[PDB]
Amino acid sequence: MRDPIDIVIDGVSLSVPMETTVLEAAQMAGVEIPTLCHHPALPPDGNCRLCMVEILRPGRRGELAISCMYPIRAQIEVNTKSDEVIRARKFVLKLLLNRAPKSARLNALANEYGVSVESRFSFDPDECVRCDRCVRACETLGPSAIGPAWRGFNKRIVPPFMEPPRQCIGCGACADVCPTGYIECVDEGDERTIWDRKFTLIRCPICGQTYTTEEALKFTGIEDPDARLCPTCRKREYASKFRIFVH
């Protein structure tokens, strides 16, 4: 444990520990900073460049840094509502919104920051902001099925070799971790289609309900036949084993 450092965010003094990001300091100090790519469960990447803040150092001018990753090791003053910060956020928001105009998250952010879609600067709007959230979620889960497959403006998150992924599991965490809702995970009856691959779902024998696929349960290595029961059915079946004695 190192000595905590005292820093000032928008005129608010606070002692934060060593090796703590600016975003964490703002979160514990009640300050709100917009983020798109950062996920607290995934190894940070700093892609979207939307959580820009001004870092003012003793004798040094304010510079833009990403709050989601910039650590607090010295005495600095952070400004989140500066004109330069607002201009940078407007620029990044314009780019992201032109990339994904139908997104609710980006439209909400634009309404917050007064940004409108431009028809001249909308090249290939495909509802993907390349935040890499899905790739990192897949990597942390254990199956590294999906991954980026190009560089530049043509960058895309695809299954390997542009075919139904051979290492996908069907959990659907990549679709859950997606700001723009570009990934779709549709379930019809006992079928789950994600990344244009069909996964068979599991139905509990006394309920007909579904919460996971066969591939996911095989991946987790849970050989208990109760794992195929839905949580309510499994809970009821276990609770039936308790012979309550009314006398």
Partner 1 sequence: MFGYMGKVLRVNLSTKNITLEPLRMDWAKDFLGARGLGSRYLVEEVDPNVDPFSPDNKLIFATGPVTGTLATSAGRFNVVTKGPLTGTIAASNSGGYFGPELKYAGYDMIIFEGKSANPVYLWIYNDHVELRDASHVWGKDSYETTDALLSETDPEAKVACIGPAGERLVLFACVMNDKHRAAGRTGVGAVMGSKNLKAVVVRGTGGIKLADKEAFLEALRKARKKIAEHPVTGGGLPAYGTNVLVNVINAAGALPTRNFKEAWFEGADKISGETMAETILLKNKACASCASACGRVTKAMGEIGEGPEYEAVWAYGAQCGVDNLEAICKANFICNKLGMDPITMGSTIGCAMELAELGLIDEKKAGVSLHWGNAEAIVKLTEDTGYRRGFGEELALGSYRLGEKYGHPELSMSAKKQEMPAYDPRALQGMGLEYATSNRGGCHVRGYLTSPEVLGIPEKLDPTDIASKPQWTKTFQDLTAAVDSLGFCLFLTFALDAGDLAAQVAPIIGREVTAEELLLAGERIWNLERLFNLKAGISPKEDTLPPRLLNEPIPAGPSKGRVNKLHEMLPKYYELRGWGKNGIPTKERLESLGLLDIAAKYSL
Partner 2 sequence: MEKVLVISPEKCVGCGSCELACSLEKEGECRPSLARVTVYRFEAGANVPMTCQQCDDAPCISVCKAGALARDEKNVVQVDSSKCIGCRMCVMACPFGNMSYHWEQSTAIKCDQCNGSPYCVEFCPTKALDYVPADAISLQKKKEFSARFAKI
Residues that bind ligand SF4 (CB under 6 A): 128-134, 137-138, 141, 143, 145-146, 157, 165, 168-174, 177-180, 182-183, 194-195
Cα separation, 51 vs 64, in Å, equals 10
Q: What is the DSSP letter of 32?
A: -
Pick what 239 binds: partner 2, ligand FES, partner 1, none; C-beta below 5 to 8 Å, kind-dependent: partner 2
- Residue 141 is classified by DSSP as H
- Which of residues 16, 22, 66, 178 is near ligand FES by CB under 6 A? 66
The distance of closest approach from Cβ of residue 232 to partner 1 in the complex, given in angstroms and rounded to an integer, is 6
Question: Any binding-site annotation on 185?
Answer: no
DSSP bridge partners of 16: 5
Q: Which residues pair with 52 in a beta bridge?
A: 66
The site string for ligand FES over 27-46 (x = CB under 6 A, - otherwise) reads: --------xxxx-------x
For residue 209, count other CB atoms closer than 10 A to its CB. Answer: 14
Q: Residue 47 CB, nearest distance to ligand FES (Å)?
A: 5
**CA–CA distances in Å: residue 216 to residues 63, 119, 133, 143, 237:** 46, 43, 20, 10, 22
Residues that bind partner 2 (CB under 8 A): 39-42, 137, 140-142, 171-173, 176-177, 211-212, 216-217, 220, 222, 224, 226-227, 229-236, 238-247
